[PDB]
């Protein structure tokens, strides 16, 4: 394990001491027991001293069970009995929440292993084994502090507090207080809104997702002394805990009955504070599938102030309360809880370190915690600023902890061997062939010590991680799903985007710089990390950059939404997607676009071919580009604050699909180039209204379909083929030469660049399969596809 | 009480270790069966005190197998028959 | 009688003696058998994976943040094979420091449906699990 208390460790070594002192050169449980009592009067030792066992009494018994002498100090270590007692003790401290293991637990574990020599020692010296395990437990368990005693009060409190529930005020007078770090400025604003008797109900709106609950412990403190008014003193804060309500309930009627009981006791009115977390569920308002309607009792209660309560709500929730104005608006009144500022994130992260140090990585590295924050606003980008954060931390706060125990130095070969020994040995004795197992046995246990010696030399991988979450690591984990390898991803985004988009350097650099500015963790998420228009017609490199943006920008290929503007005109998907004349935009705003981005807020959102849609759609979208939010889909709020908005457009097609070739000269090629590098940048404005486009962070231009583009199309198709074949376990690569023979059947002037897929099928798929079937090449072998002197040739390598 | 036991030793190596420590008074036959080594101690003439002693020693390295002795003799196989521990001291001790 | 009572105990390499800890009682009873158990008595499964799947779980599981791993793939894969993988390694021994003392307990649908009479009763069983989930 690692991380134990003194008393424990001390009890353990004393066994070995007695090993030799009593002649039992192997420390069985008799010596562990002895160890407990030989630590004198520690919790183990002391326990044994209660039941009637001196250090003396044990070692003599111990000595009477393996005899004396048989010593020579022949490698006096534990044996498996003694090892069992230890395995148990660790859990006997885990049980008590200890991330350490002390004396008590060692006797507790000893008892657990209540057969073997220890067991016989205690049962011979007039001590019942469980009487001993009792005794240790009831002295001390886990080590902790923060406690106080003396004091009682109140009578009226009786009916309420039984039910349902713990009283927040209590635990902070018990010296079990936790701050909890908010979101401090929120707490002050509650008491104006609370110590009323007319609209006395606060309602906190933020995100889930801010750690709302942090603000709440604030209240506790102020409710005691003295901020709340003079005869509004003697306030108590009772939380209406959902967990207690569901407990003992198994029906809708029963759930209502529990709420009724709370309401009946609520007669403590106007001087009682009820805390309702996630307020919406009880009101049941809004939606097409509302929640249980507590609202009938709650509405007059809220208005009366008998239910003088505090509501904890989020981004979306509020709409469904102001709709039932005013008795949840003659009660309600709002106060601002953050869309978390970066700094608030950091302190939460730091706070939860020691328990990811139970996953034993984090605590630390500092920059890496910071990485969780800084990286989260732009890179994942999938929740709210602290939820995101902590995930980056702990993922990496385990990732390396996984990398930890993979090998000894490289002495993984030792373990492999030690296995092989057993086999030889075993089967040889199974014939017997006594000594024909023997030397193999001897070789085995030799091996074993080497194995274990260099695997606990890979305690260096513990000291590596067991306080470190790595900079690069936190970032790496953020890159993995969807500091260093996110900020290297950020800084070098352009480098990453160039390796997957061939041509359209114009486009790449434009996205790169706009995203990288935002993406440096220096732009608030409340607008896409990049808004963009991706110009050129379909087939010019637009989408491919969006994809490449997911890889570079997000650190993995994952997360890309994609919405068609052409459907929001009912004439390109009015009969390819279900609906009628009064549909299509209602599907997009009302459902598709907003729902999709709620799943991954990260996503490169591609609202394609924006010319086709009328400009009116663009106004709706415009709110996405500016605000970073839309509220649609039954009042849900979708964070496009983390998205990259990419609007593609119907731009310039004729040149921007024109190929090089010789049209008049060998300078018709260099006139497809210069011409395409002109044609995007004037065609863009014609493909849309300006109102959409200005709220876009750089206007990305993608140019033509050169000749030159043909051999780039072959290299897009062949790579998609060979990769879907990788799941089989085929490792394939195409040389440029092999893409050339494929081009031989697709330099058609009359059928374009379409035949290339078919010719890839013929020359790659079909050819690889015709080489695998013959056993010329194999799966797992790396397969190079080349053309030799004009004819394609398939070669194999490792 | 108990004077013949089928003990499971964590592996063969446990049996060896044990052999290298007082295990006298034990005719013993050592099985490997399910790759785990059972060591079948057959104490010929010990009293309660003598077994509580001896059996300790064994059980520093062993636990008391739940596998029946007729299971060893049938569905297991001998590793060192004889006085298995004793024999193991010969051919396995350094 | 006589024959029955000497069937003979055939193990599989089994070992036993005592059990630790007290808190474990309410939870593990219900609902359900543990993957961990069969591998602590040498009755463990092959399991044949989907091997590269098992490793990626331990990142996502030695989290306490995005603490929940989530396997996506066909029914049908034999996804369930990957799970017994974890069991075996969480015991011994390539896992993080507290993931050597983790336990794997299965939420078995069969125990939930057994003894039920309505949807409400099914929910009651899930509620009971949540109270005990304090482990």
Curated annotation (Swiss-Prot), chain A:
ATP binds at residues 206-213, 536-543. Residues 415-450 form the UVR domain. InterPro entries: AAA+_ATPase, ATPase_AAA_core, Clp_ATPase_C, Clp_N_dom_sf, Clp_R_dom, ClpA/B, ClpA/B_CS1, ClpA/B_CS2. PROSITE patterns: CLP_R (PS51903), CLPAB_1 (PS00870), CLPAB_2 (PS00871), UVR (PS50151). Residues 161-408 are annotated as: I. Coiled coil: none annotated. Transmembrane segments: none annotated. One of its GO terms (molecular function) is ATP hydrolysis activity. Residues 78-142 are annotated as: Repeat 2. GO terms for biological process: establishment of competence for transformation. Residues 1-142 form the Clp R domain. Keywords: ATP-binding, Chaperone, Competence, Nucleotide-binding, Repeat, Repressor, Transcription, Transcription regulation. Residues 469-653 are annotated as: II. Residues 4-69 are annotated as: Repeat 1. The keyword Calcium does not apply. Belongs to the ClpA/ClpB family. ClpC subfamily. Competence gene repressor; required for cell growth at high temperature. Negative regulator of comK expression. May interact with MecA to negatively regulate comK. This is Negative regulator of genetic competence ClpC/MecB. It comes from Bacillus subtilis (strain 168).
Curated annotation (Swiss-Prot), chain B:
Belongs to the MecA family. The lineage of its organism: Bacteria, Bacillati, Bacillota, Bacilli, Bacillales. This is Adapter protein MecA 1. Enables the recognition and targeting of unfolded and aggregated proteins to the ClpC protease or to other proteins involved in proteolysis. Acts negatively in the development of competence by binding ComK and recruiting it to the ClpCP protease. When overexpressed, inhibits sporulation. Also involved in Spx degradation by ClpC. Homodimer. The chain holds residues 125 to 218 of 218 of the full protein. It comes from Bacillus subtilis (strain 168). The N-terminal domain has binding sites for ComK and ComS and probably for unfolded/aggregated proteins; the C-terminal domain interacts with ClpC.
């Amino acid at each position: 394990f690692g991380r134990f208390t003194e008393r424990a460790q001390k009890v353990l070594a004393l066994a070995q001491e007695e090993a030799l002192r009593l002649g039992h050169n192997n420390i069985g449980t008799e010596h562990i027991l002895l160890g407990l009592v030989r630590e004198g009067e520690g919790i183990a030792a002391k326990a044994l001293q209660a039941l009637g066992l001196g250090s003396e009494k044990i070692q003599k018994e111990v000595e009477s069970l393996i005899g004396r002498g048989q010593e020579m100090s022949q490698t006096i270590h534990y044996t498996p009995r003694a090892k069992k007692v230890i395995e148990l003790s660790m859990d006997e401290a885990r049980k008590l929440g200890h991330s350490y293991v002390g004396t008590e637990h060692i006797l507790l574990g000893l008892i657990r292993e209540g057969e073997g020599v220890a067991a016989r020692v205690l049962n011979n010296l007039g001590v019942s084994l469980n009487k001993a395990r009792q005794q240790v437990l009831q002295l001390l368990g886990s080590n902790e502090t923060g406690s106080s005693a003396a004091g009682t009060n109140s009578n009226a409190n009786t009916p309420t507090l039984d039910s349902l529930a713990r009283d927040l005020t209590a635990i902070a007078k018990e010296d079990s207080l936790d701050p909890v770090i908010g979101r401090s400025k929120e707490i002050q604003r509650v008491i104006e809104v609370l110590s009323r008797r007319t609209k006395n109900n606060p309602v906190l709106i933020g995100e889930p997702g801010v750690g709302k609950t942090a603000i709440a412990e604030g209240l506790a403190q102020q409710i005691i002394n003295n901020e709340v008014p003079e005869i509004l003193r003697d306030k108590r804060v009772m939380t209406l805990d959902m967990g207690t309500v569901v407990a003992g309930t198994k029906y809708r009627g029963e759930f209502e009955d529990r709420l009724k009981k709370v309401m009946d006791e609520i007669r403590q009115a106007g001087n009682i504070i009820l805390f309702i977390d996630a307020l919406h569920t009880l009101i049941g308002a809004g939606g097409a599938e509302g929640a249980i309607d507590a609202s009938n009792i709650l509405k007059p209660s809220l208005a009366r102030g008998e239910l003088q309560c505090i509501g904890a709500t989020t981004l979306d929730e509020y709409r469904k309360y102001i709709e039932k104005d005013a008795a949840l608006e003659r009660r309600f009144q709002p106060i601002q809880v953050d869309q978390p500022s970066v700094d608030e994130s950091i302190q939460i992260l730091q706070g939860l370190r020691d328990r990811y140090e139970a996953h034993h990585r984090v605590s630390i590295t500092d920059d890496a915690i910071e990485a969780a924050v800084k990286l989260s606003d732009r890179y994942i980008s999938d929740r709210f600023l602290p939820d995101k954060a902590i995930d980056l931390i702990d993922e990496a706060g385990s990732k390396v902890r996984l990398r930890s125990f993979t090998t000894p130095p490289n002495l993984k070969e030792l373990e492999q061997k030690l296995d092989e020994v057993r086999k030889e040995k075993d089967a040889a004795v199974q014939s017997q062939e006594f000594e024909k197992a023997a030397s193999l046995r001897d070789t085995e246990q030799r091996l074993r010590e080497q194995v274990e010696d260099t695997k606990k030399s890979w305690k260096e991988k513990q000291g590596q991680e067991n306080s470190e979450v790595t900079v690069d690591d936190i970032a790496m984990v953020v890159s993995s799903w969807t500091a260093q390898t996110e900020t290297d991803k950020l800084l070098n985004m352009e480098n990453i985007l160039h390796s997957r988009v061939i041509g359209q350097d114009e486009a790449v650099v434009a996205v790169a710089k706009a995203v990288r500015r935002a993406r440096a963790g220096l732009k608030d998420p409340k607008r896409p990390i990049g808004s963009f228009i991706f110009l050129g017609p379909t087939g010019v490199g637009k989408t491919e950059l969006a994809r490449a943006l997911a890889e570079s920008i997000f650190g993995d290929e994952e997360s890309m939404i994609r919405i068609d503007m052409s459907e929001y005109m009912e004439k390109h998907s009015t009969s390819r997607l279900v609906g009628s004349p009064p549909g299509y935009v209602g599907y997009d705003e009302g459902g598709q676009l907003t729902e999709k981005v709620r799943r991954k807020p990260y996503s490169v959102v591609l609202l394609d071919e924006i010319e086709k849609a009328h400009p009116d759609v663009f106004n709706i979208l415009l709110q996405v580009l500016e605000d970073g939010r839309l509220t649609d889909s039954k009042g849900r709020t979708v964070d496009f604050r983390n998205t990259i908005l990419i609007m593609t457009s119907n731009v310039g097609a004729s040149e921007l699909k024109r190929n090089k070739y010789v049209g008049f000269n060998v300078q018709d090629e260099t006139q497809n180039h210069k011409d395409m590098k002109d044609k995007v940048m004037g065609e863009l404005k014609r493909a849309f209204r300006p109102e959409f486009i200005n709220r876009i962070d750089e206007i990305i231009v993608f140019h033509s379909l050169e000749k030159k583009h043909l051999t780039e199309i072959v290299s897009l198709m062949s790579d998609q083929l060979t990769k879907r074949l990788k799941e089989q376990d085929l490792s394939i690569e195409l040389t440029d030469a092999a893409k050339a023979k494929v081009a031989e059947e697709g330099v058609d002037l009359e059928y374009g660049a379409r035949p290339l897929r078919r010719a890839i099928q013929k020359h790659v798929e079909d050819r690889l399969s015709e080489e695998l079937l013959r056993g010329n090449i194999h799966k797992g072998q790396h397969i190079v596809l080349d053309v030799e002197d004009g004819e394609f040739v398939v070669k194999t390598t490792a | 009480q108990k004077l013949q036991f089928v003990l499971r030793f964590g592996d063969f190596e446990d049996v060896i270790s044990l052999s290298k420590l007082n295990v006298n008074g034990s005719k013993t036959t050592l099985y490997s069966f399910e790759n785990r080594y059972y060591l079948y101690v057959d104490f010929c003439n010990m009293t309660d005190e003598e077994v509580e002693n001896q059996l300790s020693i064994l059980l520093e390295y062993a636990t008391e197998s739940s596998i029946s002795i007729h299971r060893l003799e049938e569905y297991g196989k001998l590793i060192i028959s004889e006085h298995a521990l004793e024999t193991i001291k010969k051919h396995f001790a350094s």
